[PDB]
Amino acid sequence: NVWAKEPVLVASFAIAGLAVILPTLSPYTKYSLMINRATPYNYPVPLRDDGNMPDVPSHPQDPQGPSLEWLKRL
Amino acid sequence: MMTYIVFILSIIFVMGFVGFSSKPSPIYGGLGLIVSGGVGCGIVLNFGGSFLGLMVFLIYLGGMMVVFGYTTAMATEQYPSNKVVLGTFITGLLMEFLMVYYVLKDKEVEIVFKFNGMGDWVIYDTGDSGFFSEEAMGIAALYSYGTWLVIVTGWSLLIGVVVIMEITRGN
Amino acid sequence: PGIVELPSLEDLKVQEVKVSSSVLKAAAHHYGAQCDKPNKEFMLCRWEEKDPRRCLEEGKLVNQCALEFFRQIKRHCAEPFTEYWTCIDYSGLQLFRRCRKEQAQFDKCVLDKL
Amino acid sequence: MFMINVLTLIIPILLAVAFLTLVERKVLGYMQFRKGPNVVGPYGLLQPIADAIKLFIKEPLRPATSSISMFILAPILALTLALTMWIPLPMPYPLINMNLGVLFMLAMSSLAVYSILWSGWASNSKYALIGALRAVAQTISYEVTLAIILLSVLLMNGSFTLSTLIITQEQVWLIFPAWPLAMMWFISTLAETNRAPFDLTAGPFALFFMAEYANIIMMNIFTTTLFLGAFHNPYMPELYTINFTIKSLLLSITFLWIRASYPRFRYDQLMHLLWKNFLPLTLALCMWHVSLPILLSSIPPQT
Amino acid sequence: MWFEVLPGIAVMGVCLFIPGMATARIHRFSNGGREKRVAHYSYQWYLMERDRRVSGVNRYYVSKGLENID
Amino acid sequence: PFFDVQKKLGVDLDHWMTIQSAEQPHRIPARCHAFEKEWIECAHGIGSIRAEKECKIEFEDFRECLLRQKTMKRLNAIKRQRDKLIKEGKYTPPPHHSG
Amino acid sequence: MSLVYMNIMMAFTVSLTGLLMYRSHLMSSLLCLEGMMLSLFILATLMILNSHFTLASMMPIILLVFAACEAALGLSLLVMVSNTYGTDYVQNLNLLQC
Amino acid sequence: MNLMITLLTNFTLATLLVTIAFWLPQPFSMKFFLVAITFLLFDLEIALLLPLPWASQTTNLNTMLTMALLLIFLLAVSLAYEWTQKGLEW
Amino acid sequence: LLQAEKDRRVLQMLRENLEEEATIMKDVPGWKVGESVFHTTRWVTPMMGELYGLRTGEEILSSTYGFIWYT
Amino acid sequence: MNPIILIIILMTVMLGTIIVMISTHWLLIWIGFEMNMLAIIPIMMKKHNPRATEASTKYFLTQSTASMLLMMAIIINLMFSGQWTVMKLFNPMASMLMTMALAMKLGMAPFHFWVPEVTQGIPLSSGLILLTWQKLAPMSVLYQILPSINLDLILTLSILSITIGGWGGLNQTQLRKIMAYSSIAHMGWMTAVLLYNPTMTLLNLIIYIIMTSTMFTLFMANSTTTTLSLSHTWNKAPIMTILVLITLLSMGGLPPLSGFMPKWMIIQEMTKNDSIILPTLMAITALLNLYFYMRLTYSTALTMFPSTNNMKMKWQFPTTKRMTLLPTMTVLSTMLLPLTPILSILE
Lengths: 74, 171, 114, 303, 70, 99, 98, 90, 71, 347
Prior knowledge:
Chain C has helices spanning 21-26, 28-33, 39-48, 57-75, 80-89, 101-113. Chain C is mainly α. In chain C, helix 3 runs antiparallel to helix 4 and helix 5 (80-89) packs antiparallel against helix 6 (101-113). Chain C is elongated. Chain F is mainly α. Chain F has helices at 5-8, 33-42, 56-66, 69-88. Chain F is elongated, with a radius of gyration of 22 Å. Chain J has one domain. Chain J is an all-alpha fold. The chains are: A mainly alpha, B mainly alpha, C mainly alpha, D mainly alpha, E mainly alpha, F mainly alpha, G mainly alpha, H mainly alpha, I mainly alpha, J mainly alpha. At the H-I interface, helix 1 of H face loops of I.
């Protein structure tokens, strides 16, 4: 109906509507936020030892803290 | 090719501002403002200097004096030096060299300030690990935290569009 | 107002680890793994008390840990570490994906012998 | 060694432009049924050398201008832009590694708009002013669109550094994640260099001509760099230099070949065309290239 | 045919070949077989400055490999 | 009239732009961070007149942090006295790498 | 004190006097207003670069874009003045007298 | 000042070219003005838009997506407004 | 490691500069010898005219403005 | 003009003034003043005469150099103790430039030359909205930035504003120039008490905005630009005459009438400070700025000028002009004498 008169307008509105709506439905924006968060620009500053913390491991080989393992599995 | 090069570019900057504050023909004024903006770009790139002077170079020296010369072309003609313009240029150069001499061979010349007279390598960082050329991530933060600011900025520019078409005979 | 209290040159003379910087980058991961354990004490000293001229003794201690680490990596395997850092060296800014197979060779060396 | 680099970059541009004149005349000649220039020497190379030196010999029309210093000041600006504007474009290792160079590209194109305006003012009477004013308008009509498309095509690349571009175009060419954006970009490069199908209908015509054809070679070099390029092996970069020069040659031939066979546009048709056809579509491609990398979970590793 | 436009194309391509080969040759020649180090960020600049300081010759490309551990 | 819609609706639309020592995007400090923290905590809940005439010590300390006025004055006096005694010619100086 | 600030403020005051006194055309006056604009741009930008005041670096680009659209409104008014007269002179405005 | 050295060499060699090229041989329309301020205001909004690829790396992405789409959508509103109100026609 | 090297280097420049001050200004009246201008006795980072001052050209031009117009 | 476009531009004027009010950042104050300018320019040139063209040109140049001098003062404020807080300043020079920029922006006797010229060649709706909002918006800023001002600035500007807004007005017979001179005099009154107790200044702002709304509403009810037209509107309607009487004398400020309360309370909290010769000089000039009101009254309602016919014709047709809100603002503008303790409604 309008596809014959101004076709570049209709194509622009279609791709604009998907560029607005399409970021809602996603299994990937959570991955976007995780990858964008997990990049250390600054130095990871240590902390004073004992406020009686049964967490936060001392050797960086110890997997007690939250590591990243979804990276190497894409 | 020496240490006081930001100072020298500041002096050529004041030279340009005097050179079109002498009120020439407006195409000579636009030429002088392009020269002044180029050396101001040189100054701000010499203070390091990543993005902002290359940003003003597109806007004023990329899309504002173009429109000024465009409007000088369409509106005025200036169809064919004078003692007034040349006298103001000589008095401006006199003020320039007077301030430069009385600062360089002294401590300070003050309007109301305390200007320590030496080269401006001071002050600067002591070679710290900046790693992102601070202004870059600064203006990168203009979108995350800048909620209200870009909203009122875009709304002001949209209203500027409707203002220009109405004044230039809306619709 | 008041005078500054700056320390002496005889305390401010420790031999640096005068390696170049590209090899220092090329050996950085195992420098952070085995050593750099007592320098988080140094860095916590620095961030709590923001006074260099107060936490410099731990600077001496990280200097000697780095020097001992470089002694240990020099006298044992690898000599292919030399080929590895000159492989990572001249490739502009250092991407680790530039020289990967000799990184694997040096890793197999240090894994097997040490 | 630095001024030696300067001489090896800015001396061969004159040879490049004059041999581009013979290349485009021979290409138009074989698009037609023409040979020539081939009578003057072997295949016509000293014939562009000869007409360049003739036009330097041939006596100028005496001015008959106004503001002789401004008549000096415009073509010197055009040719010094054409000289200064091959610096960060990487033939394999570029002249100055910059944090940002593509905004510098667009700003120098805006300075070329200034030079066209100043030549049109300082040239002659009213009709030359009106024609050059419309030419400045149809040159300034596209630094919206080309800069917008540049922003969209390197939003997939994070940084302005252009060496991250020459890295991250290794797997597939960037012509494939944006073909219509690149095609509209190439139309805007025809608009920046101002050839047919974009109309035109004085002195020095040699320097005007020089600035235009160096602008053409510059925009096609930046076309080849911006969109494609094969793998760069260090300690043998002559491979990348050869492949770069070959694809820039092919795209320059295609550029002149698109000039060769189409009529010029009506001026109001040109403005109507640009605004009401390219500009909503460039915005739509911008917003879709904004919304895509948050959906592919791949923002570029902006160092 | 187009067999004779290819001399003009070849000569103009050689005139486009010289700045790439010359630039890469001078970059590999100005640091003794090394590459000219880039510095976009101040971290790499401080690393390059301590690199040119430790080598003793006040030129960064030499870079004092492993012969001064102890 | 300075209204308080800013505090009543609660959304801090502007308080991040306002001072230094806010949440920078990469957590880097300014040049005079600690001086600002001490001056702001000195003049926080104070009636802006005895805040003017009691925190003046740290205020002038912060001003000469931010501009480094007397510090450059002392450095210029050092270089002028160095210049007049090198014009005198006593002890051609080994402050430049030498002894 | 960073002595460059003295000459930049002096150049500001020179641009301000050039904005105020003008005899022939309004275009040169608006252009010196643009120069005064650029002066404030440059001074604030040099300060924000020197002090490492890194978060609120919105100022140079936002002052730029806003006072540029101010100049756009000024160009529209000057085109209207040149429309309603033969020229755009400072004179021929002797209607609407105080 | 090394790119200033390149700038000086380009400018001086170009002046050598010009001086050898010279000393060896010896009303208006309203519709022009709409395009000027149209370019000016849209180029200012481009000046707003162009630091977007600096900004993609942050931990608050939803607001940046929303306001970036708001800025381009406003630019589209301005273009469609002058399109519907016969702004650039002949 | 770089932080420790930088700390030792800047304390070295501070000790050198204060010894050179205490030699060179022994004739002017007044002049307390090494008092920091600030009131609060805290370690402050100096203004890069106290680290790289009185060096005459080479190291200061490669230090403050070296990276700014290096490439 | 389109009504959608006009309602949107009114919304932008509202938005700019609220951004001037609420924002603790200096940049947003400057943006609010600028957006106020950019929106208020097409409120003028609502017609297409060159009168509005020259008026908006003069207004734009003075308005723009005021905005840029304000930005100069703010960048000097950050040259000194550097933060974007609306507070006490840190410079007599920056405060000096800021008060001069807000005096250019506001309307004040060394910088008042644009006001009668810009009000001569504009429609009355545009004049009403520019007077109300452009005398409203900088007063919030001055109310904020009071504690760091040299009083010589404000007081010389105030005294000179009251005496020049008085001495202009005796010779001008245009209604708009009379209202503009009255505006300069009342802004001098509202500037004078700023460093003493600004509750008086904002209450006087409320009163003067109500008075200006009543005045330009009573001149919207009949397309009149000269006093001869006011005599013809005496002939065609009698209630307009007695309202011109009461409202013009309320501009005059007599004690049974509501315009005396802003003068009297100012003299109260001005003379609890021990300056006395300055109150009596200001109030003698308040006696001075009443004569042009009085001859305006004598033209309209208390003498009877000869009238042209076709008012014979006009008597058939009703007074079918719409009034925005006339009677509420009228009796609020005149009968607000015995509500003296509504001073405390403000702070």
